[PDB]
Amino acid sequence: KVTEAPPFDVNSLRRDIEEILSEDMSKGPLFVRLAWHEAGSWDCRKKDGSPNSASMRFHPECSYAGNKGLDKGRNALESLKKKYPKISYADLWSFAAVVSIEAMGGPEIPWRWGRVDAKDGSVCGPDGRLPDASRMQDHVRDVFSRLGFNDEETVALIGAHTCGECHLENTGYVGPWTHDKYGFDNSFFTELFGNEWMLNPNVKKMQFMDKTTNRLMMLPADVSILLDDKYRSIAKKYADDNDYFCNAFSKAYQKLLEVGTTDLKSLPA
Ligand code: HEM
Ligand code: NA
Ligand code: NA
């Protein structure tokens, strides 16, 4: 459709977002959580939640349980915003996530610019939009169905737990999903199937740890892919073919960063 050079140097910003990661690879996954959290307020029946507008900059959305710790995300981008002031926060967040999935070795995800920032909290959809980790496949399905994803998409997207880790101080959940949390591959689904999960007695919010090492963790929501026959099957394929996986995630995540958007423009070469 519409291709246009954007009002910022996209290859200078790419290069800087990558520079941010080299000094601190812990921002990569965090950057992927923030864009997702900025997309996941959406309702495709209700056409609301203000997804992909950096509405999370405002109250009440900034204060919701599911978005705790994401200030580190926003603050870690506030200087690239000074240095590239013709970029909306919504473009900067979605672009930093896309770059961060490339850097950690995942797929190169097609990215279009044109997102327009909420200028106050009044378009801020309600809470309970973000998924509850403490819940199971029926809640998971209820959320990603309101967001507009199929079962293939939902499981692909939750694949993102392949990178990053949970923080006591953020969600009272603790530790990484894989032994390579700065890598983005299908090893979430690897580690899911190729372990025995068991209660972690040491954490007040119910989570699972791996029998082998006790170093990996899984959320009730995560382990619900194994209990849910449908999710299980797809989870199997992704565990078995990182490419079906890496292709699945690329299209799903791009769709996530463009739910509730119009007038987006392709980058030229
Ligand atoms: C039912 C669905 C999901 C639930 C319940 C869930 C829950 C969680 C929780 C509790 C954390 C830890 C937050 C923290 O303490 O720092 C987390 C981390 C993360 N999640 Fe999700 N999530 C889900 C789906 C997704 C999706 C769709 C993505 C990306 C598309 C994603 C990407 C991440 C990433 C990258 C992190 C790591 C954050 C960091 O390392 O700083 N999750 N998720
Ligand atoms: Na939003
Ligand atoms: Na990895």
Author numbering: 57 to 325
The authors write:
One of these is a hybrid heme peroxidase, the T. cruzi ascorbate peroxidase-cytochrome c peroxidase enzyme (TcAPx-CcP). TcAPx-CcP has high sequence identity to members of the class I peroxidase family, notably ascorbate peroxidase (APX) and cytochrome c peroxidase (CcP), as well as a mitochondrial peroxidase from Leishmania major (LmP).
The TcAPx-CcP enzyme is similar in its overall structure to the related LmP enzyme with which TcAPx-CcP shares 57% sequence identity. On the proximal side there is a typical peroxidase His217-Asp278-Trp233 proximal triad, as observed in yeast CcP and in soybean APX (sAPX, His163-Asp208-Trp179). There are two molecules in the asymmetric unit for both the wild type and mutant structures, each one exhibiting different electron density at the distal heme position, with one appearing to bind an oxygen molecule and another a water molecule approximately 2.3 Å above the iron (not shown).
